[PDB]
Write a protein that binds this ligand. Structure first.
Ligand SMILES: N[C@@H](Cc1c[nH]c2c(Br)cc(Br)cc12)C(=O)O
Length: 238
């Protein structure tokens, strides 16, 4: 009924429209293609190395503010305690997939900072820069947009992930349903109102978040096309 609640609902509906467009990217059709072996489809998994530990830091140090009495910021802090745990899931599955290979320190560094992973590596950086001077209600819009994009990615990746978990009888934690199925942010947002200026800013936020996620998926697609002869090697980690 109140005008402030209609504006919030418009932003939450905008997130759904971006999600619908985001799900149609060709990278997700490849990852979901059951006719290609799941090891081949997960060749892009090491690309996430340029993201996952930065996402841990985004939650520990950029989103979180332990010295805050604000009601919304304390909800955000609770959310960050969950998401800051997931980098260990990424490293768990990196080893299970046979991608935790021995190499020179400089090869690991040149991989993470590769120009082919520029958008992947800078996603959390751009989010932190965008979020720094945001009031907590706008930070929540950032987090909700980010969580929606992320669920699209891991619903897709959980398909070849759970196929390998079943075919090898090993417990996957990151490309796995348990990660997908993890007072939520969306529940608080639906009860909260936005001012007129906040609705304009929230549109800019949602547009930027899904643009940077789309750039990241674009890099994943180019990476697959450059590594068609390679695949995960789960047997190397037995
Ligand atoms: N659930 C993921 C977080 C996440 C959220 N958004 C993401 C995007 Br957009 C791309 C990638 Br790769 C990962 C994410 C995690 O916990 O590490």
């Amino acid at each position: 009924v109140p005008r402030g609640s209609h504006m919030m609902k418009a932003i939450l509906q905008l997130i759904l429209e971006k999600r619908q467009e985001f799900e149609k990217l060709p990278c997700f059709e490849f990852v979901r293609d059951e006719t290609i072996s799941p090891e081949e489809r997960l060749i892009l998994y090491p690309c996430i190395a340029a993201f996952a530990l930065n996402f841990r830091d985004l939650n520990r140090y950029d989103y979180r503010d332990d010295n805050s009495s604000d009601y919304y910021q304390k909800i955000i802090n609770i959310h960050t305690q969950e998401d800051a745990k997931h980098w260990e899931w990424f490293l768990n599955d990196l080893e299970l997939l046979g991608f935790d290979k021995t190499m020179r320190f400089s090869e690991a560094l040149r991989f993470v900072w590769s120009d082919d992973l520029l958008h992947t590596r800078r996603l959390c950086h751009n989010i932190a820069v965008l979020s720094h001077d945001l009031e907590p209600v706008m930070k929540m819009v950032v987090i909700e947009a980010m969580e929606t994009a992320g669920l699209v990615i891991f619903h897709a990746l959980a398909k070849p992930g759970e196929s390998i978990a079943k075919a090898t009888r090993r417990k996957y934690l990151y490309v796995a349903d348990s990660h997908v199925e993890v007072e939520n942010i969306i529940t608080i947002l639906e009860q909260t109102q936005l001012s007129s200026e906040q609705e304009e800013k929230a549109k800019e936020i949602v547009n930027k978040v899904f643009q940077w996620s789309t750039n990241l998926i674009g890099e994943f697609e180019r990476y697959v096309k450059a590594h068609r002869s390679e695949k995960a090697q789960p047997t190397a980690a037995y």
